[PDB]
Each structure stands twice: as structure tokens, then as C-alpha cells.
Amino acid sequence: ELQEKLIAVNRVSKTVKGGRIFSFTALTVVGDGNGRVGFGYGKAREVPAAIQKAMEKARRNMINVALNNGTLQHPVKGVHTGSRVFMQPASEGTGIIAGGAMRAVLEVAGVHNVLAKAYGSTNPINVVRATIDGLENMNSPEMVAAKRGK
């Protein structure tokens, strides 16, 4: 019931004294399938150590999302660095139809059938960060009615 999946692995470099030194970065997202989404970055010298650090950071640093029946509630826009992201609840608008690196976080998030369209930059490290910010500041009808009295 953990439901982990990796989005992006890259080879970064460092350029020391004698030549270059190549390191690998993972970027994974875990989530239970009912709210509870996390992402982790993690970087290491080989690929399986990188993904393992990424999963291990992603299992902690996990955020609650106030889902609807199987989906979002109201249309929400989350931004991070250069990466602006729209989402629309699509009240059984079948299938998760999101961009790459947004399909994954929305998939393990437990949502099933939203409409997305990322704008701006679509770097995978910043398009999540713009989905969680997004799903984090999406509030439910029992939270809005809690705030404003009824």
C-alpha cells in the first residue's frame, strides 16, 4: 500500500581537477492511493543508490490532499519556479490526463480522472513542486464551511 514510482533520473557532472565526475539524480514520488503524496529527490554516484535515497526521502515529507470521490474538487493552479500548472476536477472526466511528471504524482496521489495542462517550464523537478503546491492549497467543502461559519 506504499505505491512508489520514479519519474526522472539524470546524469549531472562536477568538473574537478582531473577531468569530470558524473553523478546520478533520481526523482520519485510515493503515495498511498488516498491523499498522502510525497516526492523525493536524492542524488548519488550510481543509479540504484540514487533511487533508494529518493524513495527514502519521499516516504517522509509526505503531504495530505483533500480528495473528492476519486478526484479533485475545484480547479486549482499551482506554481513553482518557472513551472505553472493548471488542474481541473473533471467530475469523472475519465482517466488521468496530465503531462509527463504530473501523471505520476497525480497517479500515486490517488486521484483518477482530472484534466491538467502544465504551462511555462516543464522541468520534471519543478512540475511536481507545482502539483503538490496545487494539491496542498486545494481545500474541501467541509474546510471552507469550517472557515466561513457556514
Partner RNA sequence: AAUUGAAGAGUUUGAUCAUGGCUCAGAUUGAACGCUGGCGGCAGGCCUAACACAUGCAAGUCGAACGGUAACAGGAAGAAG
Residues that bind RNA (CB under 7 A): 10-15, 20, 81-83, 86, 88, 90-94, 97-103, 115-118, 120-126
Q: H/E/C letters for each residue in 107-133?
A: HHCCCCCCECCEEECCCHHHHCCCCHH
Cβ atoms of 81 and 134 within 8 Å: the answer is no
The per-residue DSSP string of 46-97 comes to SHHHHHHHHHHHHHSSEE-----SSS-SS-EEEE-SSEEEEEB--TT-SS-B
Q: Which is nearer to RNA, 22 or 146 (CB)?
A: 22
Give the span between the Cα atoms of 146 and 51, in whole angstroms: 40
Q: Which is nearer to RNA, 36 or 54 (CB)?
A: 54
Q: How far is the CB of 91 from RNA (least distance, A)?
A: 5
Cβ atoms of 107 and 5 within 8 Å: the answer is yes
Q: Which is nearer to RNA, 9 or 59 (CB)?
A: 9
Q: Which is nearer to RNA, 94 or 142 (CB)?
A: 94
Q: How far is the CB of 82 from RNA (least distance, A)?
A: 3
Q: How far is the CB of 3 from RNA (least distance, A)?
A: 19
Q: Which is nearer to RNA, 36 or 96 (CB)?
A: 96
Q: How far is the CB of 63 from RNA (least distance, A)?
A: 21
Dihedral angle computed from the Cα positions of residues 57, 98, 140 and 55, in that order, rounded to the nearest 10 degrees: -10
Q: How far is the CB of 146 from RNA (least distance, A)?
A: 27
